[PDB]
Amino acid sequence: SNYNQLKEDYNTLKRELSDRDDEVKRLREDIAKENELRTKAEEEADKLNKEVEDLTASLFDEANNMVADARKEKYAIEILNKRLTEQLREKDT
Amino acid sequence: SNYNQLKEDYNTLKRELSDRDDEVKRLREDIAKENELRTKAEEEADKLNKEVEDLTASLFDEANNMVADARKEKYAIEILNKRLTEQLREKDT
Amino acid sequence: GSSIMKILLIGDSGVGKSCLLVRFVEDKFNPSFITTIGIDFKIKTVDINGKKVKLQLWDTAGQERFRTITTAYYRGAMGIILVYDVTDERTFTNIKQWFKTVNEHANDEAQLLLVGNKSDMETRVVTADQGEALAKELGIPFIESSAKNDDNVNEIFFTLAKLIQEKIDSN
């Protein structure tokens, strides 16, 4: 009686556990699952910004070589101009 | 051996349950959180993919002027060169 | 300093998607990054029917790299020009495709436009009627031109402009 009741409450909770065990195996998958999403929405945003930063540098790096080139030429012309402006005194002198 | 071991075992199971049951109540809330994240994470990767253009726009817009402004400032000196070459073009003769 | 309009050019290489812009916009100073970056952006204030509107146009080399971004350009386009060369046939074919590619991301409230280009050389392996077919199948207007006459080039854009502008007045 008291013995038999015990023998069975043991059985009754032996189940409630087996069912707790289950609800865990579950929740543990639903999470490892929802972390895969959150993991992609990060894997994503990163890719983008890696580009956005890669663009930014490359663009600006290029623009500068251009601006550089323009100035390199603008220099040579300025030199040649110095010479002339000066040959314009050797024609007034 | 018998009744002893049983009541001991029952007390042991009894605990293991209170363990699993808490573990469950916790995973339940560990989702609620790991979810409030995938939520935000996914929004952001959006807010980003939206804003990109308008941003890369301004990047290009600035890079343009940079090379443009440079290039104009050269042109002008080219003009000058030509005109000085026209001033000393006359003087000579 | 007024009303903006986002426009972009969709199409393959060789099509002369670039040259059309160089030509559409009158600037010798503005640089070209499309050779190096694979992208190039250009503003051009234009008008018709007293409207101070500024056009923003993207030209891309499509190339993989920043595709993650060039892709964000469809998402914003207020109008987009699907372009093809009429001296190359494989050029024509893909248009149904690019069109599919546009419906995917292009917030379809976008003003599309078929554009038969390079009608210069007359290896014209395609005819004006052919192009107006797909255009009618797609439910979008059509035109042609050749940046070797500066003809219809400006039309190409002034067209899109009105179509867009009006699709804004029904609202």
Side-chain angles (χ1 to χ4, degrees):
Chain A
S1 166
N2 263 36
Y3 179 91
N4 288 334
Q5 184 53 40
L6 175 73
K7 223 167 189 176
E8 95 160 2
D9 283 353
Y10 176 98
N11 283 301
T12 286
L13 311 186
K14 176 57 253 305
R15 189 171 313 105
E16 276 283 57
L17 183 83
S18 182
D19 294 1
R20 241 28 97 74
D21 280 331
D22 288 345
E23 192 180 357
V24 151
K25 199 197 184 198
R26 274 181 38 221
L27 295 207
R28 277 177 121 48
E29 306 179 320
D30 286 5
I31 252 141
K33 207 152 66 180
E34 253 216 27
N35 165 290
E36 270 312 69
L37 308 199
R38 204 204 43 142
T39 256
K40 215 179 180 186
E42 286 187 344
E43 285 279 42
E44 169 159 338
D46 276 292
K47 192 198 180 192
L48 187 59
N49 304 207
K50 298 289 179 302
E51 284 186 355
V52 177
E53 60 180 54
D54 160 61
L55 174 56
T56 297
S58 302
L59 185 62
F60 279 130
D61 269 296
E62 190 61 27
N64 290 319
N65 309 308
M66 288 185 189
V67 177
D69 275 339
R71 304 199 79 230
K72 196 191 184 182
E73 303 184 31
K74 161 256 200 51
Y75 172 59
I77 298 319
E78 289 164 318
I79 275 178
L80 300 194
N81 279 194
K82 266 292 193 75
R83 187 76 169 83
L84 306 188
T85 300
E86 147 210 312
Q87 302 167 66
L88 282 207
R89 298 161 184 157
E90 284 161 45
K91 285 302 179 66
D92 170 288
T93 195
Chain B
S1 187
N2 220 269
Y3 180 95
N4 157 58
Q5 257 297 304
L6 176 66
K7 198 200 66 184
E8 190 168 295
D9 285 345
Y10 177 67
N11 279 352
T12 273
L13 168 108
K14 253 197 294 175
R15 276 171 267 125
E16 283 281 43
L17 187 77
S18 294
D19 272 5
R20 211 68 58 263
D21 174 88
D22 188 48
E23 167 168 50
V24 152
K25 293 184 189 295
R26 281 194 293 83
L27 289 186
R28 293 244 201 72
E29 49 149 58
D30 268 359
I31 274 281
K33 303 175 185 168
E34 176 77 349
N35 169 273
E36 211 36 47
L37 298 214
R38 192 216 56 176
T39 259
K40 310 255 190 167
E42 293 187 324
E43 287 166 43
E44 212 59 37
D46 190 62
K47 202 199 171 195
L48 262 56
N49 217 91
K50 176 173 300 185
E51 315 183 318
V52 233
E53 176 179 62
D54 287 52
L55 161 58
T56 64
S58 291
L59 286 197
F60 278 95
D61 185 58
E62 141 132 50
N64 295 326
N65 295 51
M66 260 172 66
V67 173
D69 275 354
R71 279 172 180 170
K72 297 180 167 182
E73 305 188 7
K74 175 170 88 64
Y75 200 46
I77 300 307
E78 183 106 61
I79 281 178
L80 213 211
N81 175 79
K82 295 176 188 165
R83 162 161 308 325
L84 263 16
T85 313
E86 185 52 33
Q87 296 192 166
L88 159 150
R89 190 266 172 172
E90 297 171 55
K91 274 283 193 177
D92 173 293
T93 307
Chain C
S2 272
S3 188
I4 306 76
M5 307 226 311
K6 306 193 178 185
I7 291 65
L8 126 68
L9 301 195
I10 284 177
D12 286 271
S13 60
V15 167
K17 219 188 298 61
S18 296
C19 302
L20 207 167
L21 278 149
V22 191
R23 189 174 203 72
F24 175 54
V25 189
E26 299 158 62
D27 199 5
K28 42 158 90 164
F29 299 134
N30 265 181
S32 162
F33 294 120
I34 189 80
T35 312
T36 41
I37 290 341
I39 310 199
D40 228 314
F41 157 100
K42 298 160 173 178
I43 288 190
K44 157 55 121 304
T45 303
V46 170
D47 85 290
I48 347 169
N49 314 304
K51 56 186 180 55
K52 205 290 184 179
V53 290
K54 304 182 288 183
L55 315 194
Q56 299 188 8
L57 349 168
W58 292 99
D59 160 40
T60 132
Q63 69 180 310
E64 14 59 32
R65 208 178 205 194
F66 324 93
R67 178 179 300 123
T68 313
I69 320 184
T70 33
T71 289
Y73 298 154
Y74 302 74
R75 175 183 179 173
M78 281 181 62
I80 122 70
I81 279 67
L82 312 100
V83 192
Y84 68 95
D85 187 358
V86 308
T87 75
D88 291 307
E89 310 201 316
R90 47 292 195 184
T91 302
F92 193 96
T93 49
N94 293 267
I95 307 169
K96 278 196 173 184
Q97 221 337 297
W98 286 91
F99 187 73
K100 274 186 179 176
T101 310
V102 187
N103 311 309
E104 286 174 45
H105 333 67
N107 64 301
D108 304 305
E109 182 193 4
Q111 179 60 67
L112 287 264
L113 186 98
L114 237 305
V115 172
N117 199 72
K118 273 198 173 187
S119 17
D120 297 297
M121 316 145 268
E122 303 166 310
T123 307
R124 230 230 186 67
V125 299
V126 183
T127 85
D129 280 301
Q130 310 196 54
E132 306 191 61
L134 332 151
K136 185 180 184 178
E137 296 184 57
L138 306 155
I140 58 180
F142 171 81
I143 317 174
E144 302 184 306
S145 69
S146 302
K148 294 271 190 170
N149 321 305
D150 196 59
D151 159 73
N152 279 302
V153 151
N154 291 237
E155 286 86 301
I156 291 191
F157 301 83
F158 284 80
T159 315
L160 223 300
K162 294 189 176 70
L163 294 165
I164 293 178
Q165 172 49 65
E166 63 169 354
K167 188 183 299 184
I168 298 178
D169 303 309
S170 56
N171 310 305

